[PDB]
């Protein structure tokens, strides 16, 4: 069976409404293929300095009759350095009316993130370790696994439709696919890590020139922009006219002139002949002050974030270890089938 869930385009992130507890407390949480844990902002949390973290729903464990404490510490650090911490528990999770019982989640009492995060990646990427390198609580069934085990979906799989850059909403379908929302055929690509939702990216064609890559790229709904290894990003920046700026002690970001020509397209070539094309508007990110970030940035990690993913329809299949991709077709027409 399938569960369609609306994605709110928040700007940097895409979020959905998900209820927790016996009393179905609504949380608005980021849908994140790049992490694997579902955590919620406790109503008694302390937000980090400068962070409005209690405006997107909060969770009061003491008002849920079904909340169970697991007696284990939770800590996570994300790629941008933000963190959350709390403790592990289990409770009922409800997604567009469909409830799963005894779902392990983290009750977060301190965070520098604006809202909770629903991590839907592989169980092997759960944040269950401490800074010593020891595992402090075991790996567990995260939301997609539990949806399968409780009979709500047939297969641990979900389709991602972020929709166009201007769209207010997109859709994630757990256990289904909307065959109206792409052109060509969905091409299954093998996932290249047992822990991360990466597929092999063969090359990037930018301003008409090919740049060979040949390494995995994380298809991360929870990243705003696109990240490449420093050397490769610098080659692309030399072609694009982007400028590397030291913005803090150990952070560097590419900027680009806000009036840059964005008439062209950037092409991403994957396995089995698959290609995704991205309009170049996606690489000029307005800062609102007459400066613009480039949509590609340096990192040790390769990540194709939302500025890529808006242009693909993706069927992530965590049971098969494939991600099937096709050029998106923006349409309200819908032809949904279970997977």
């Amino acid at each position: 069976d399938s569960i369609s869930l609306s994605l709110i385009n928040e700007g940097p992130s895409y979020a959905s409404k998900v209820s927790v507890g016996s009393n179905k407390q609504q949380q608005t949480v980021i849908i994140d293929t790049g992490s694997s844990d579902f955590w919620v902002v406790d109503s008694n949390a302390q937000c980090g300095k400068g962070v409005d973290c209690k405006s997107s729903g909060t969770f009061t464990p003491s008002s849920s009759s079904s909340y169970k404490n697991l007696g284990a510490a939770f800590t996570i650090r994300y790629g941008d350095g933000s963190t959350s911490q709390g403790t592990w528990g289990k409770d009922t999770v409800t997604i567009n009316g469909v409830s799963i019982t005894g779902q392990q989640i983290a009750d977060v009492t301190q965070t520098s993130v604006d809202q909770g995060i629903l991590g839907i990646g592989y169980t092997s990427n759960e944040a269950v370790y401490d800074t010593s390198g020891r595992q402090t609580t075991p790996n567990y069934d995260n939301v997609p696994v539990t949806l399968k085990k409780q009979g709500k979906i047939r297969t641990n799989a979900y389709s991602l439709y972020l929709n166009s850059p201007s769209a207010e909403t997109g859709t994630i379908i757990f256990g289904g696919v909307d065959n109206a929302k792409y052109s060509g055929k969905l091409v299954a690509e093998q996932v290249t890590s047992s822990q991360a939702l990466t597929i092999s990216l063969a090359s990037v064609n930018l301003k008409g020139s090919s740049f060979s890559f040949g390494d995995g790229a994380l298809l991360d709904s929870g990243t705003t922009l696109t990240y490449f290894p420093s050397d490769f990003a610098a080659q692309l920046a030399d072609k694009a006219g982007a400028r590397l700026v030291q913005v803090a002690r150990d952070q560097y970001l590419y900027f680009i002139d806000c009036n840059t020509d964005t008439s062209g397209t950037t092409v991403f070539n994957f396995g089995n002949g698959a290609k995704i094309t991205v309009p170049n508007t996606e690489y000029v990110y307005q800062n609102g002050d007459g400066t613009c970030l480039w949509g590609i940035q340096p990192s040790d990690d390769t990540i194709l974030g939302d500025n890529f993913l808006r242009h693909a329809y993706l069927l992530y299949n965590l049971d098969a270890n494939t991600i099937s991709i096709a050029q998106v077709k923006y349409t309200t027409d819908s032809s949904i089938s279970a997977v």
Binding site: G34, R77, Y78, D80, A127, T224
Partner: peptide
């Protein structure tokens, strides 16, 4: 942002 960059989500782990």
């Amino acid at each position: 942002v960059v989500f782990a």
